[PDB]
């Protein structure tokens, strides 16, 4: 019965869209977007997928019960002084924006209606294939239904559970970053094949598939990474000798600082959100 | 298309690979658990254990594996190999493909071993990974010199319901190993790395854990599904300024990428030494 | 219409203008040794800045950043209200030039702009943000201006700190790529003339591709590299050095530097 | 000028190489795409559905392109340049000229393996790059013991059509192999890694490419169009405490130069590697 707004129409609010039409847990005529300069192909591929499209902010809010913010961090503001007259009771405004605090939105909304609905959302692009993770927190005025219905929906492109809203710059750092260290990573490894005489679009299948296997591997499995790595190498083998060259290089370390200065970046942006 | 639900299946090796090929065939569905019979040297191991309760059939003599099977996977370690060969030359029948799972052991020493006994061995080797325990395997393999057409048909319909399985020349499959077959230990290296960087950040480890996992395995999936180059989808998350941008640069300023090229060539090297001190001897 | 110029960039844009036949070498003014070349031209020269307001329409500022203020306050109350002031200077803030003209005429038309020494042969890059009081018809006509000696397009201000790190300082460090790159090839036994020629002709070539492409750097790179082959294993060493966190790290240090000049200007 | 505008063009690879040469040759015009044919062993690449749209003849039997060409380009892997040259080596006739672009691959080696079909074969070998598609490219040749003083003029004018073009001694063939002939792709990495520093400053990911990628090509373009030692160049935009100064310090302090040193010289030395392995 519900409707779902997109403020914003990049990769996210795509991603968002199109995961949920395939998990068929609304029909895309529920889902409106609305972005002022929405690239053709943007438009062509939602309008295809039955999504309603319209230039005004407002016609957005007007149609959708879940209002979902998929922008700029520094458009945030700038939205909900636009669309902060149009907040109706009804409506649960969910933040994709990364960095910006509950705070900051509750207390722009707040000018307009007292007890704003407000669920800060810390997702990523492969809820596209719905295979995302996903993490929420809820605010002041969020009722309790509120955030099973976040859980509910997001559950359906991806894993998704509550955490408190001092962890989502973390998370931020850990898999909303995630995806694109895998691709850089997926990338190196086919230029390892490359390098060793394999095809390049072999090489990059194969070890896509690897990282997808073993990945899923860990989550199926009650055993440490560790473990798994130790059932992997044999005595003298090939894989404990790479694994050597990866420890000399500090492999582990990079994806430690990785997560580190994603997460600290995202903190500096919601300082900048609070100021 | 092929027809191979009355195929009897063998394990020479009753470690990690034959525990993970068969409890992803009897997970997909096309072998029955007591179609399938493993020997192993020890009945000790904890792979015998879970192997026994799920149906498959366990002995400690190869010859009695071979008897039983129409297939035979060789899982042992490389060096291990042409005594296997020894054991079970004579035994080989005209029924058998032998398919060899042993990193760097090249079709053609196998096929000089069995040809001493008769003369047309029907070999398939072969280079696959831990996740089909799970079907989400990756898989490649060579024919040899008398595997007929259906042989190379039949065992690409085997390995494709466990995950990803294609047809390689043999001289790739040495690469292959550092790529897809060593991948997997470079992911749990990677999820144990990520997990830390998470704590460290404030998570509990067992949402780090679970968080790190699904973002690799979500991003996998999306470039198996893409038409795009991992670049491209590098490209399409990373916000100008943003967070992502912030901790790409952090990696390339460590070399990330050279060390996963890094860790293809050793793992590739050391196959085809393993395989270069096995032929001398 | 007339153009008049207030240096290296100050020479690369009359050059490429005159060559684009977009404006005629006598409708310049510009006020060491790119003034041999310059007078050559049929460009006029004159030492006196006021003179080059006097006569022209477009004002470009090719002066050092910290110079600007004092160019300002010379020339400021020869400002009519028919110019538009172009700042080429690295790091000054359209606020900071208005501020100066202010104090002498209400609303001083000015466009920020950052563009590169290829303009010389018509290759630039070039950005502009619009001021306070330029009207839409001031930034199609730099638009229209600058295209005729490279790509143009416009930008927000605070772009163009970014901008200057990315095609301002690029040129740079091409130069010592193809330096070092010629190194390389002499290394290995090519004449220095022969390797310099081929360097840059393979610099140029790439990058043509990329323009005229759709498609993503790292799948032209894969295109380039067979499997096991000599491109492939140069990359590795590449890899292996950093080779692009340095460049991350050029663009970085470019644009903080260029946002530091910005506060000295506004300060 | 030679005439040669009515002679077929073959090439004995499908590949990405092929379709470079194909596509420059005809956007230059200096050939019809008609007269042109590609023969390669896996019909299912991209690129040879990309010359099927452009009218070239492609077939699958390496005897039809020899029979089809008067000049025959070998665009295969460098191993495979033995079998290659057994299975046509009969079909060389005296109207060609043999046209190696495969890397390493001495006209030594070439020379002996056709001279036991019929003496005197033509025989050219070439190292180019990918940007001949864009008529930008950079290829040398050398001729062979049995290359005509026509062959070489005309050898010149064919690829002078698609980009910058001279004669070289076949012995400085393995350094221009890494210099200009990876070239193409130390260029391509660093436009993505410009394009993420952009990005890390703020800009969108398309301005970033394209600007990274204009600044390249004016800046190489400066130096082929100036007497000016890329010193001199880089001198000239380095304006005192300025910003592209301390770019350049963070470059210096990573060795960027050296890494472009050991590039240049692990291709090159791959590059004789393969032929020694050949040989
Ligand atoms: O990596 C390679 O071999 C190709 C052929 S020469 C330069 N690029």
Redesign the interface.
Known sequence: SMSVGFIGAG?LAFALAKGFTAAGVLAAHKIMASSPDMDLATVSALRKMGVKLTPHNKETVQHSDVLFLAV?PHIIPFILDEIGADIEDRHIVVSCA??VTISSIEKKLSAFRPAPRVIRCMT??????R???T?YATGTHAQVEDGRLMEQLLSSV??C?E?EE??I????????????????????????????????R???????????????????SEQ???Q??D????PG???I??????ES??????????????????RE?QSMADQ
């Open positions: 990769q700029k990364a960095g990523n692009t492969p809820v596209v294939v295979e995302g993770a993490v991806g894993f559970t955490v001092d962890l710059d973390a998370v931020t750092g850990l898999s909303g970053s995630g995806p694109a260290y895998a691709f850089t990573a997926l990338d190196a490894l086919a230029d390892g094949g490359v390098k060793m005489g394999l095809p390049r072999l090489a990059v299948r194969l070890g896509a598939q690897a990282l997808l296997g073993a990945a899923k591997m860990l989550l199926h440490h990474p560790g798994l790595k059932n992997v190498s044999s083998g090939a894989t000798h790479a694994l050597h060259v990866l290089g500090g492999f582990r370390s990079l994806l430690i600082n990785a997560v580190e200065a994603s997460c600290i970046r995202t942006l």
